[PDB]
Amino acid sequence: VIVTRSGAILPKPVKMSFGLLRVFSIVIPFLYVGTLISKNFAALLEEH
Amino acid sequence: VIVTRSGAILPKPVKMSFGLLRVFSIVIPFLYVGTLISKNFAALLEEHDIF
Amino acid sequence: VIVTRSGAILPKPVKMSFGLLRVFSIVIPFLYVGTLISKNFAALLE
Amino acid sequence: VIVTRSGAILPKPVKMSFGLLRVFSIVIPFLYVGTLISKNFAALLEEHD
Amino acid sequence: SGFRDRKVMEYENRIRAYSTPDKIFRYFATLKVISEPGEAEVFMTPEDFVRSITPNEKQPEHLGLDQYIIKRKFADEGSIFYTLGECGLISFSDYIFLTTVLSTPQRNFEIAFKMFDLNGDGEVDMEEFEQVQSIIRSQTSMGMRHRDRPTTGNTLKSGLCSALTTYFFGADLKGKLTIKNFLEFQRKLQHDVLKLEFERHDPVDGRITERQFGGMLLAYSGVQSKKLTAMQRQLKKHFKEGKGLTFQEVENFFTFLKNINDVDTALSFYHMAGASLDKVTMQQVARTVAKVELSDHVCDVVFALFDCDGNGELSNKEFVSIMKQRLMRGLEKPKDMGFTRLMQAMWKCAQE
Amino acid sequence: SLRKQRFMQFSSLEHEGEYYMTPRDFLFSVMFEQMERKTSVKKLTKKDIEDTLSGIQTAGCGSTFFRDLGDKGLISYTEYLFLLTILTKPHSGFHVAFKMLDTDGNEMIEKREFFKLQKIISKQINTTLQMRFFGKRGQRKLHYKEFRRFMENLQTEIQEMEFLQFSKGLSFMRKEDFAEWLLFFTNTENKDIYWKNVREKLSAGESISLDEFKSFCHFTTHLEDFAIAMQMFSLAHRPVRLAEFKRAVKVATGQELSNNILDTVFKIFDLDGDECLSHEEFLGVLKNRMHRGLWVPQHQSIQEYWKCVKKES
Amino acid sequence: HENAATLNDVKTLVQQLYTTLCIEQHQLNKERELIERLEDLKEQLAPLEKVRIEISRKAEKRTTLVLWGGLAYMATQFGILARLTWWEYSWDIMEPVTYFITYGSAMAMYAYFVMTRQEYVYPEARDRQYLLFFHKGAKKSRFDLEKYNQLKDAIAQAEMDLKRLRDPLQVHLP
Amino acid sequence: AATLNDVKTLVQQLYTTLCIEQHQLNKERELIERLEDLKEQLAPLEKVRIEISRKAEKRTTLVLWGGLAYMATQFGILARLTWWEYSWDIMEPVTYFITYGSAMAMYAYFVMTRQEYVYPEARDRQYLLFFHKGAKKSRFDLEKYNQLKDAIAQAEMDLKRLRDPLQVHLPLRQ
Amino acid sequence: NDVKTLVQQLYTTLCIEQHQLNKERELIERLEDLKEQLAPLEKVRIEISRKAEKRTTLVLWGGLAYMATQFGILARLTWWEYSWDIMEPVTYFITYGSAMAMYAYFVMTRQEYVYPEARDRQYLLFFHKGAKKSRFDLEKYNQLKDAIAQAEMDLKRLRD
Amino acid sequence: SHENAATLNDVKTLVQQLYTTLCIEQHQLNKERELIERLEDLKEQLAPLEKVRIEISRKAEKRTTLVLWGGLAYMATQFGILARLTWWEYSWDIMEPVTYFITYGSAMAMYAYFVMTRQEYVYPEARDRQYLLFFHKGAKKSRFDLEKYNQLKDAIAQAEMDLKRLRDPLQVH
């Protein structure tokens, strides 16, 4: 809800400091590592 | 939800009389009619076909 | 819930005026534009 | 949430003891009797009919 | 016809041009022989093969993607497909090989053979004919779109089919295949496929009506009904609307067509040499560059759908562009996404 | 462009206003393509016509008859463009051109059809090559095999007359100036990197014969085929050492180059240890050797790279 | 001591007041009064609780109808996609059309959230739908819902007041 | 009269202020005892419920497992029938009409019993069904238990409400 | 001791009858000046709470148009240009790609992504970011709104 | 008196003596003073049991906001694996079953979570449970006697609810 019970306006929500930086810098270096872990897996799968 | 504020068991929740039959009388015939409507639509998309 | 604790039936819920047309006329002219952004994409990818 | 309205820490939640063993054991045979009933079924659909 | 006759044929094309060749094989394949102690392989009669190439051809109504005629003959003895399998039944490992040979320039085999060529030049034994076959396959469209799927059995870890390994390398599996008789084998194929595609028109007395030949010429394009109706007008103008064409008549035009990389030069010259293109022009050039004699009737129907709209002036840049894509059948396309071959292509030139 | 300009840069010999050409400065433009053009203006009248055409009726083999005719003969602006194709265009089109414009099955043309023939190959007043090909009044025709054998003569003349230019005026040239001739159209960045490895491991060995050098100039006529061979060696992962490189030039030419030249081209391009030639651009320096192009400027590259992907992909 | 002297004095004086002023009987009659204004009030809506109880079953007979007309429709779609698939157009021709009505729903369960600012979940979705079928009927019968909706607030407020006057812990009517 | 009705309330507010301070000690005399016979009366009645709520509680702990075994078997007959017997392109139809078969059962359950079918609430509902049926068979007198279980808390909420007026001397909060 | 307590209780009832009869006439004169310290301040908030509504009612619509173009981008690729076998693996890595945004949104704001909640929280972020630009004191405002609740919660607690 | 005239005017002034000759105004100002003293020392026993809890609720908070990320890395490395193994390492149809039996393999792992904790798996109320689990796992380690803290926190909450209630502007105290 927007307003509180009395009628006042709720406080500004706290956005995470440097949010998208933390997001796009833990999804990108773990999306690449998610690729490199697969390349050297299939290329190892055809051996055995 | 098992017991109320004061430890008294909640009343037995009311079921639907002929519950598992009211549903089959509305899911079975409309499951069939679900087929019959496509048949007589694709089939009647040939004789009266324009484009 | 239909009624409040006192038994008073809740007020009428408000509907958006022409609320069906105000969405069925924002998806149509934005579904077609969904093609041009793709029809000119493949014609660039060829 | 985490603290009651008074400000006290909520009591420790209770983890069903041996929760994972209780859970793997009910989903290994059930998954396994899953294949075993599909193997012995396709062999009955194509030959005996 | 708004039914599973057009909405399916237009699905056939989208499966003939973007789906993995494993799906293309087991869709068009109809026979599934199990004449074994319990094994099961899936073949395709030679007629299905040519259907697996030409667009706008509908699979029989019932034997679709996994409806097969289970067995427990097909191609003529002289037909090339008899050297395959048992009678004419193409296996999978052969169909994928049989389609690298159909759509590969003759130069590539001249080079592939003459580069591995263990001792000499032009001859290769079997184990050298697996690298060569695998290399040329690793460049064609159906070669980079084929990850082996053992789940459905359609794998390609088998050697050559071995009903033709002997046709190539003798019974002892020791003969060195010269490059000369191979490029003869390939021509024996492309002429055999062109026959099957021809018989798939119901030739009355070995004659194919003029309109059915036009459709046979433009089949590897989009929709061009307006063009076949254009020549439909000239059917009354030239009065040859009841003559038709024979198989030897059409075949010459496709032997002429194999030299399109030069007829493009010839026609462009005549265009800028101050000469108007007509029957007497192309009739002559077919004799001087391709050395093959074309009949007037073939040179009648070509201008009937390729001229400047009713004047016999063959529109070169329209003619060569279509014949370029019909000579090599519709299997030179990338048959895949255009992203990676563009993104990495953008990196290399945009950086400078 | 530059073809009209570059021809006018050297056009010292003008007659009746129209800029003409003698093989001397004509060769100067094509032999080394940098002569610091100082062509003055001189007008040669009909008196030069009689002397030059008489020069045609004296003597000359393919190698000499264009060379000795320096400051002599006659070449127009159009014939320069036609001759340009002899160096910057494959000899395949000339075949289909003759057997389509000849007298319908002779591969020979008279004086007339040649006038159109010049304009034809351009898109794709009696001059010397005219009387060289026909009679004094157009008595004989122009047989294709006689023109086919003719362009091969000029094809060898251009190489030899510039061979000695890089061969210190001697029939021989060490491997050093060969590299100078090899990468005479190189970049600035990678040039020294070659010269660096040229400096250290390339010993001052023997020279190369005149004929064998031209064999390499014959090898650079079918390099397109050679692009495939090395490309196919990339797929079947294998080095490009002499054993296979010899196999590569074997099919890329039909002939077989000698080992001496193959040793040099290795040592100039064995930037990895004589197993990994720079085949991705080793043929690049061969293909940009005589291309008459330039590098796209960066701000134009901001626009033309949109055309890069359209053809490069 | 001396405090209890005056303490017993104020005790015995007000005791007379509690007796000579009939306080024990005074507070009793006004409690009798509000327990009477709760009867003429409970009688006041009685002519409405016999009418609203008619609306709240008609508007309930229709809400339980649309509920079925949402399971029938959900079934008659399962009947199309299963007969247009196995003895019609092959399954692989429908898989691109059976996904554009799965993503077609997750776009019609959002256009409903914009059309009425509450996410689409079943329990409340019938409630909002019940109230609409109510007021539409409550508008045709023309009964003063405003009064009823306010009247039934006084009953629940007066009775809560009465049950506080008779608190067995804070005696007011001994 | 207006001059005397208020003072009648005033002296009423006075007499109670002279009486209630000990009237609590009169109340807590028995309210701590009425809360004590209910306990010794509940203990024999509640020893049954602590059993009924276990033989109808392990009956719903294995519906949780049985609900998971089915969810694993329906994953084991699809992992063999996809990589071993058939191919995925022929099993994709079935494993879509299952995904759509549930979305027509998670909705029937709504119209069958007016809930949402979230896990933590559908367990207790299927527990109460197990409980009352287990109370009816065992001749349990449920109406007496739960009615007795609130009066034993009504007294508890009355005692605590009476403590602070006697320990910290604050007015009754009602 | 204990006697001091009861006399305290019976003194209030002899004085509070004039206390409650006073606070009724005192709350009014104390509540009304707020209702005049509020109206000129309310007229600003009633406008920022509307120019921060339009900014969050075209994010609602805009969030639906994106669900329409992304439905027209794929209804054209799948059928006209490309096939379904080449367009399916990309219409899964977004049905799973978004299931990675609805979780990256949670960890970004500690609140699960639900349409009503994620609409209100967006509105609030537009209000304060908009209230900071018109520069009307939000601290005094909300402390004049709760102060009214005080002067109203008790005037209803004065039935007697 | 026969009315409010005298008898009430007696008792309303008779009470005045007890209010003044007993110094009852010091009783209120002290019965209210005792509470503040009773509340001040409470906020004094809590201060040592708060600087150590505020350490736990930060160690057990970082160790929770790390599992939150450690679930987003998974949902990324489980997206780089499939984006590679489906375009140019395998086909798409070799990787459709394997990518569906995890879409279904989760609707069995987020149900086995329900059975395992009697709770429902939604992000907001499944995070704190793991935060609330990391607290006591730290509390049992540092043995800061949560049993007193959580209880003593109720006293300060209760011994203040009446203080702010004793000063009610309506009643007199």
Side-chain angles (χ1 to χ4, degrees), chain F residues 2-32 42-49 51-93:
Chain F
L2 60 87
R3 293 92 193 170
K4 192 81 166 186
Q5 290 72 12
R6 207 263 193 284
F7 181 86
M8 281 184 58
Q9 289 187 355
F10 276 50
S11 297
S12 275
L13 283 73
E14 65 271 14
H15 187 185
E16 294 178 353
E18 308 297 330
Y19 295 87
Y20 282 100
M21 186 74 34
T22 191
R24 198 148 278 161
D25 48 0
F26 170 52
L27 294 196
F28 291 170
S29 43
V30 301
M31 284 299 164
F32 48 88
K42 69 191 64 180
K43 208 272 188 174
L44 276 164
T45 318
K46 175 54 206 91
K47 62 95 175 180
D48 193 86
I49 294 308
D51 184 73
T52 43
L53 315 174
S54 55
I56 316 167
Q57 210 180 325
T58 63
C61 80
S63 305
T64 195
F65 81 94
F66 269 136
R67 173 66 271 170
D68 60 359
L69 265 43
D71 273 18
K72 214 159 169 312
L74 183 137
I75 292 88
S76 67
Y77 157 71
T78 78
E79 307 323 297
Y80 161 73
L81 275 294
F82 161 75
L83 267 295
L84 159 71
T85 64
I86 315 286
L87 311 94
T88 69
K89 196 260 181 180
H91 51 304
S92 315

Side-chain angles (χ1 to χ4, degrees), chain D residues 15-24, chain H residues 65, chain J residues 116:
Chain D
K15 292 189 292 185
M16 187 188 247
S17 40
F18 277 163
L20 264 156
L21 177 63
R22 294 183 181 277
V23 175
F24 275 170
Chain H
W65 302 120
Chain J
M116 197 174 72

Side-chain angles (χ1 to χ4, degrees), chain D residues 16 22-23 26-27 29-35 37-39 42-43 45, chain H residues 61 65-66 68-70 72-81 85-86:
Chain D
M16 187 188 247
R22 294 183 181 277
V23 175
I26 186 167
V27 85
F30 270 87
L31 171 159
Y32 171 125
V33 164
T35 73
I37 190 180
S38 177
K39 156 171 74 180
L45 185 139
Chain H
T61 199
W65 302 120
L68 181 135
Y70 153 77
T73 283
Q74 202 255 330
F75 176 86
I77 73 168
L78 268 293
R80 169 83 172 211
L81 208 60
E85 314 285 316
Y86 290 4

Side-chain angles (χ1 to χ4, degrees), chain E residues 146-239 242 244-257:
Chain E
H146 164 67
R147 313 300 216 304
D148 293 359
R149 193 180 180 192
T151 299
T152 175
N154 292 344
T155 177
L156 182 15
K157 280 139 104 124
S158 332
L160 272 181
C161 147
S162 150
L164 80 181
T165 187
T166 79
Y167 170 95
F168 280 152
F169 305 135
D172 59 16
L173 273 300
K174 304 298 188 305
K176 294 161 145 307
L177 183 142
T178 188
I179 182 57
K180 182 252 186 188
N181 67 356
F182 182 86
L183 286 197
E184 153 61 35
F185 162 88
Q186 152 170 0
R187 196 270 311 161
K188 182 149 164 274
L189 183 134
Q190 286 175 309
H191 166 274
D192 207 312
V193 166
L194 191 137
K195 171 168 182 50
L196 290 190
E197 153 191 351
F198 184 84
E199 309 279 353
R200 175 73 197 211
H201 283 297
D202 303 64
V204 290
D205 192 1
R207 287 316 206 84
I208 290 303
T209 172
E210 294 81 3
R211 192 213 166 281
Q212 282 180 28
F213 164 68
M216 214 196 77
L217 187 67
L218 285 77
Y220 294 72
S221 300
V223 52
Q224 45 265 12
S225 45
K226 65 182 72 65
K227 199 170 311 300
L228 60 92
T229 71
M231 56 87 53
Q232 195 70 30
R233 269 87 181 170
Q234 275 60 239
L235 299 193
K236 300 94 190 173
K237 311 305 162 53
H238 58 242
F239 299 92
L245 311 99
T246 187
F247 170 73
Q248 210 54 50
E249 175 72 88
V250 60
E251 204 281 335
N252 283 121
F253 182 77
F254 281 81
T255 318
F256 165 75
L257 200 56

Side-chain angles (χ1 to χ4, degrees), chain E residues 29-67:
Chain E
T30 72
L31 309 195
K32 172 187 163 62
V33 175
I34 54 172
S35 199
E36 280 91 3
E39 290 71 23
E41 193 172 3
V42 53
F43 308 138
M44 46 197 308
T45 176
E47 172 49 53
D48 290 323
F49 177 85
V50 75
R51 185 156 41 214
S52 156
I53 301 294
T54 80
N56 312 328
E57 293 256 22
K58 173 173 45 60
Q59 187 89 350
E61 78 301 329
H62 196 274
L63 41 87
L65 193 148
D66 269 313
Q67 298 86 296

Side-chain angles (χ1 to χ4, degrees), chain E residues 244-306:
Chain E
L245 311 99
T246 187
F247 170 73
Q248 210 54 50
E249 175 72 88
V250 60
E251 204 281 335
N252 283 121
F253 182 77
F254 281 81
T255 318
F256 165 75
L257 200 56
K258 287 169 195 166
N259 298 325
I260 196 69
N261 48 37
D262 311 333
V263 193
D264 49 8
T265 64
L267 300 160
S268 45
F269 287 173
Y270 266 108
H271 178 270
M272 64 203 204
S276 200
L277 275 302
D278 60 348
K279 281 200 292 185
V280 308
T281 49
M282 198 184 61
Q283 271 281 356
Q284 175 59 35
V285 304
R287 198 182 306 108
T288 180
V289 58
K291 310 301 176 299
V292 61
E293 215 64 47
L294 289 180
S295 73
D296 48 6
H297 195 184
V298 167
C299 301
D300 282 321
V301 72
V302 159
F303 304 147
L305 53 85
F306 276 151

